[PDB]
Amino acid sequence: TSILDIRQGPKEPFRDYVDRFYKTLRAEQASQEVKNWMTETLLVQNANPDCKTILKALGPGATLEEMMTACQGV
Amino acid sequence: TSILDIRQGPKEPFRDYVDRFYKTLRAEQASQEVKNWMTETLLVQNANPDCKTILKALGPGATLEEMMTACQGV
Amino acid sequence: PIVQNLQGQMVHQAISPRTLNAWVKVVEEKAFSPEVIPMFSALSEGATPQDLNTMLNTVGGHQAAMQMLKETINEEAAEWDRLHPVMREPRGSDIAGTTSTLQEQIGWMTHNPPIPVGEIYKRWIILGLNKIVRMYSPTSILDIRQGPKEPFRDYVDRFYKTLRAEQASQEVKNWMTETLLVQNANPDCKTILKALGPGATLEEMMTACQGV
Amino acid sequence: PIVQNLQGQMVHQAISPRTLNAWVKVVEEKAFSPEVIPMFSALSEGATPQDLNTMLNTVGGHQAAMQMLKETINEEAAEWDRLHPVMREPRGSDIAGTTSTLQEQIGWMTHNPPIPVGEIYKRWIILGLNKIVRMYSPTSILDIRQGPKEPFRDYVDRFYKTLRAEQASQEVKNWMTETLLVQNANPDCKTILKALGPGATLEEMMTACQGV
Amino acid sequence: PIVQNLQGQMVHQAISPRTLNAWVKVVEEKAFSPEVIPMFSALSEGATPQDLNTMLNTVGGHQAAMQMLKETINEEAAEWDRLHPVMREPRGSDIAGTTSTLQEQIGWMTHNPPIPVGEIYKRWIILGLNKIVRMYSPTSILDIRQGPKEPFRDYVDRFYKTLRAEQASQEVKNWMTETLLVQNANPDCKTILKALGPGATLEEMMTACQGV
Amino acid sequence: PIVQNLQGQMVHQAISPRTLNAWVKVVEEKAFSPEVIPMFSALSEGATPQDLNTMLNTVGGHQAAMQMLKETINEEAAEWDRLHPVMREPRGSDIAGTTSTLQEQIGWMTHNPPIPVGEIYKRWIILGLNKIVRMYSPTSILDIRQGPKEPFRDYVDRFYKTLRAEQASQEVKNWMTETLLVQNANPDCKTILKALGPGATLEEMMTACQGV
Amino acid sequence: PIVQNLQGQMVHQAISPRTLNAWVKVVEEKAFSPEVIPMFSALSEGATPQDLNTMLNTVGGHQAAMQMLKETINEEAAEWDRLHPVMREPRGSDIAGTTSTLQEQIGWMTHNPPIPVGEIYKRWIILGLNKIVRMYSPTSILDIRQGPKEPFRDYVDRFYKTLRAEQASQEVKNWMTETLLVQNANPDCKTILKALGPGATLEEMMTACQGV
Amino acid sequence: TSILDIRQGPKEPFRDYVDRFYKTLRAEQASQEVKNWMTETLLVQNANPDCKTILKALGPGATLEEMMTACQGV
Amino acid sequence: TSILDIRQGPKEPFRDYVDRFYKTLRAEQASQEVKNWMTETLLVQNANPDCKTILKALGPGATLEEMMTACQGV
Amino acid sequence: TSILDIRQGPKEPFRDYVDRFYKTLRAEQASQEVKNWMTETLLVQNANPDCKTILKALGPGATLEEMMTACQGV
Amino acid sequence: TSILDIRQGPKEPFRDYVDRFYKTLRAEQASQEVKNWMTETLLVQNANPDCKTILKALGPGATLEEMMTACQGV
Amino acid sequence: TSILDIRQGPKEPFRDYVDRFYKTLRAEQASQEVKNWMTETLLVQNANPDCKTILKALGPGATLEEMMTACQGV
Amino acid sequence: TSILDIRQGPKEPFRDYVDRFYKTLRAEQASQEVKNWMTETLLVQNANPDCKTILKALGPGATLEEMMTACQGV
Amino acid sequence: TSILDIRQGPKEPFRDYVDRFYKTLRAEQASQEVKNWMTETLLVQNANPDCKTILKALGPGATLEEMMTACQGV
Amino acid sequence: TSILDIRQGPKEPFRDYVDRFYKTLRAEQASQEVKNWMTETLLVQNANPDCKTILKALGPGATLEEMMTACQGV
């Protein structure tokens, strides 16, 4: 699995998806600005729709803390 | 249509509603203090229930760029 | 307040216990509806900054309201020092009455011409109370709509009450009373309010809508 | 108001903070029902034009009411100058207390005979408050009808309250109390009110309709 | 009212603005229920005829009530001149305070022994207010009946309130409280009120009917 | 009340018109609920017997209440003469202020040590008002039961209000608050009030029953 | 309170009869809701311990409340003697005003610098009133939940009112307003209050929830 | 019957009711101030709905002669 | 028709009956006291019952003005 | 009919109602201050719902010429 | 049974109820001021509806001899 | 009939029974203390039950006036 | 089409009728007072009934601005 | 779960609820004044209806040892 | 029966069980600390469940008075 094809399932809790995403990101180990892009754009774009709407409600530039505490009810 | 009648439909994209709103706001050509008030309060109040909560979460300081960026995912 | 002594000197008279209890009834029972600003302005009327602090100690029970007052008073004291760079000089915290003595406050209020540090601080307080009154508004003006069988007098009262709570400058208020007040009327009144045309004063609107 | 100093000179005493708060409660809580005119006339009782302006600053929150007062005061000041063409002379804006000093107002109020610039300006204000009370009337007198099970005392109270808000001269009021009050009664009372004949006083009407 | 000056002379102090506003609240808000007589008698307490006229100017808004006062005052002034045929003499219209100067009123009130023209005129006014309170009664005493589940305390309150509005002399009042109060009770209370027998005081009636 | 004159002599100041109107509002509007005793005791606070008679003249409209006051005052004046057999001597009817001059009352109140004829007569009046408050109680304490969904704070308020109207000595009151207050609670509260055991203070009872 | 005599000496003026009646209305009619502390603090404002005892004699009708005051006053008087071991010395029961003369109280309040035995005893009383206000709370803060159609302004008012009755220190209050106020909101408001994030001030919470 | 129980029947002539009223009033023999009050107010209040309006139209000053003269036509 | 046999019909308005009555009275032209008796007694006695009750509610001695304004609703 | 009973029918022309109103106003012959009040307020209040709104839109200053001119089209 | 639970049955003789009441009052052995209050008020309030009215008619001053003498006929 | 066997019927008004009782007592003309006993005890004991309860509600020693006014509703 | 026969249809918005009217008036180019008459009288008389009533509610002499803003809801 | 969501089930042992409560209280790691408040008030308020009454009967001073000792029998 | 096998029945009132318990304890006459243990532990443990819960609601160390007054409603 590339980081590009890690995706959140319908039932999958956001914290499980985030852990899969960042483990894949850590292994795939692209350069820092590619990691910035992936953690800002792919992390949201590959979230499931119910998380993706809650994430975009935060506006870009939020921390991972704020993203996880936001999605924790989904 | 008066600007007070420009209301976002339940499935209408926020960008299409903003386009209608600011077109009507330009046609009505109320003075700038009134336009400022309308862009700050009325644009939010007339958004549909999906977008309206996103816009409130940005706070009154939101800029039209931020408002559209956030609502683009609805 | 300030009174003349029998020796002719200006001297402090403490704000009376029932004037303070009247202000307590205003702060407690009115929940910062807009009446709380005229009633403050009235009960404060002669007040020195020491007396005004004695009044604000009542708002100190509403810790959320009290910090907005503290903020706006600190803000205006700083801006005062900013516009007025340095019989001592009336500095911002001296006008607030934290720094100044009572004799300094009365002195400022009784030089010729006086420096009205009471009325100044009272104006900073009223600007803070305006923020609090705005926060405690139950509705925005866009939520105020006339009922299907509600008198136009009641709807006008609700409208102007809400309009008076809100931040709107006079130009925005004028636009609201000209256009929201018509738009948000019930259809029976809205017909007449349109038929008068846009140049109608509130008197003409009300006397036309009377009993509808 | 005016008081005697210990030196025997007439001098200003400021209108008390709780008298102002009483007037604020009148302006705010009564929504310009006709009670607001007797209560103004009472709380104003000793007032100089400076004090009357301090009271009108309370109405300044009701910008629609306040401009009717400004209008009627400017109108009466102009008409005063028109009837009274020119120890200085009391001009219209001097009676309003925009132009005059406090010492000028008290002087006029304490010459022999005095010029009662307080009671004059107070009368122009009461004429403006009459306009405002009329605008805020919930109903016209023709809308006041008795309920099918409403006491005639309640209906008389509603009627005379509305009659007291309206512009009617005393001749028109007399016709209304003689004929509308009968016409708009419920049929049970209307029978008795007719059977008394047209020359019945309100006392005779009420004591006949008592408990119906 | 009358006060002692620092020079020792008796002198007029004008009836205070909030005492007048208290009287306005009595006249306006209580609709001439019987409370309006004790409250008049209280707020009037020190009043000269000039002050009493300043109070009656409040009733002048209720033109039907005001003419009953004018009538009863003219009637009693005439009867005063009739019983008292002629440091000037206190004539009826002088006691009314239309004819007399303020200094004449205070003089009469401060001769030794005084002529209490204030308390006299105040008594004629209270006799007029009694007529008005009677006219505004919502019910006659014969209409006052206890509800099927109404406390005897509430019914006694309603009864004595109505009894206090009515024209009944004390002998007629005594008969009413002895017999109507029993007759018009609900059957549960009426049983006990009969079982006490006719010589029962109101205390004995109430404590027996308590909680029924 | 009594005040110091500028000449240093103690002198009468008449009980103020709005203090009398405050007492009228207490007598009229509260229907002798137990609040009427603290409010009497407060408004009376400085009163001479002349002033206390001026207050009782307000109760004179409630002829049933007024005769209980007359009775209790005559009773206590007689018992005063009985305990105190005979700068004149303060006799019972002199303390009542029917017999004594105003100067005699103030003299007694300002000898060294004083005879507090005001506070004495005020205590006889309060004993009469206690009888009247007891008569006007809507319920006996045995009738006070908690509703099935009534807060224990409301029930405690109703209970202690009724307990405060009744004749119970402090020992009987203590037994009532210990046992009736539990017995008459609803079953939800009654369970907890029993589980605390009999030695529970009202604070412990209320904080346990809070929100039940 | 304390006033300056015409001879320049500080002297007692008794707490006015209508200030006492205002305090009676606070104790009687408000049932120890938290307003009773600001209103005490206001009406007390100039009070000597003799005056404060005259105010507490009003609470003496609420024997359960009065013993909590007695307790807290005795407790603080003992702790005062404990921190302050022994122009006489102000001992605890002297500050309570059981032991001290009136002249001793005014002396302490007018030495240079003064010992503010009035404001001290007033602070012990306010600590007792806080205990009583807490006992009479109708609900704990955990019981305060928003209704399904209740304005967030009303719910905030209920919440902060209850929060103000409770014993919570400011750190616990801060946690409550940050987290209970969100948790106990209805789901419509709770969504927005969560979407603002945890760092939201009450102003930001209210203006976002306005009209929901 | 007390005087308060003496009430005019719906078809009873006013003269027969007055005869019952003043007979009962003589039997009860209340003092003259109370009798005056009863003859003035209670005699009117206890009349039937037909006569009661006639009596009110005469005003409180009506004399028993005038009251009976007026009600004779009912 | 004698004045004695002029009578108001069931549907006849009072003013029409009064005009018939006074025209007959004017023609029959009895002496003044007989006219007084007829205008006070026959005028009421020959009114229809609904007018006759309203007339007797006025009490004798009323003017013809007051009699007509009273009956005008019948 | 009193002037207070003169009310415009739902299909009645405003000119026919004005003719009835001013005929009744002339018959009642109330004093001129009362007539002025009736012509200003009561003529408007008694108009039918179609005309009444037209008359209110002219304001209280309307003259009978203007009132009739405006209502001629109903 | 507490004394507050001792209540007279609808057909129970007043003497049998008094026997139960004063037996329970002796067992509870509350202090004499409380006993006095209970004998004066509670004994009356707990009587059945037939006897309770008899006891109230004697007034608060009734003595147990008088109370029993009166209720013996129920 | 002896005074001992004079008794009130079920429908008999108390005043009729009292008149029969005291006429029999007057004729039978026992000594004064026997009359006292009969007028206090037999008069109540031979009343019908509805009167007898109302009489005992008065307590012994009442006058005949009070006994008759009490029973007058039965 | 003469200006005399330009007429508003049932569904036709007032602004479309006004534009047809004034284009025809501009082409037909009668003298100024005839144009005044046509723009005041024919413009209203040839409006459809729902507009014609709203126009006459304005009273004669209104501007074309006020006429168009008035009819814009029809 | 927040500590405010930790509520005792109707059949859940008080020791198992306390274990959940103090585990969540340790995880949330609010400052000690807030923990003190939660252990004193919230632990009681969130108990089930059986245990809650037991805990209230111990008073606010109860210690967790005493609270558990008492509720062990539920 | 040993004190160990004295037990409260389902219907048995607590005072009857306590009397059986303490009579058995008095006869079996174990040493004082064994009696302390039995009166604290066995007395509660052998109570019926409805009493046992009410007893444990008191917390250990209560007097026998408080235990009996507590269970008296069961």
Numbering used by the authors:
A (entry chain B), B (entry chain C), H (entry chain C), I (entry chain B), J (entry chain C), K (entry chain C), ...: 148 to 221
C (entry chain A), D (entry chain A), E (entry chain A), F (entry chain A), G (entry chain A): 1 to 86, 96 to 221
Give excerpts from the publication.
pmcThe mature HIV-1 capsid is a conical, fullerene shell that encompasses the viral genome. It is constructed of a lattice of approximately 200 capsid protein (CA) hexamers incorporating CA pentamers at 12 highly curved vertices. The surface of the conical capsid is dense in protein-binding sites that mediate interactions with host machinery necessary for transport of the capsid through the cytoplasm into the nucleus.
We determined structures of hexamers from peptide-bound cores to nominal resolutions of 2.6 Å, 3.1 Å, and 3.1 Å and associated pentamers to 3.1 Å, 3.5 Å, and 3.2 Å, respectively. The first switch alters the FG repeat binding pocket between the hexamer and pentamer, precluding FG repeat binding to the pentamer completely.
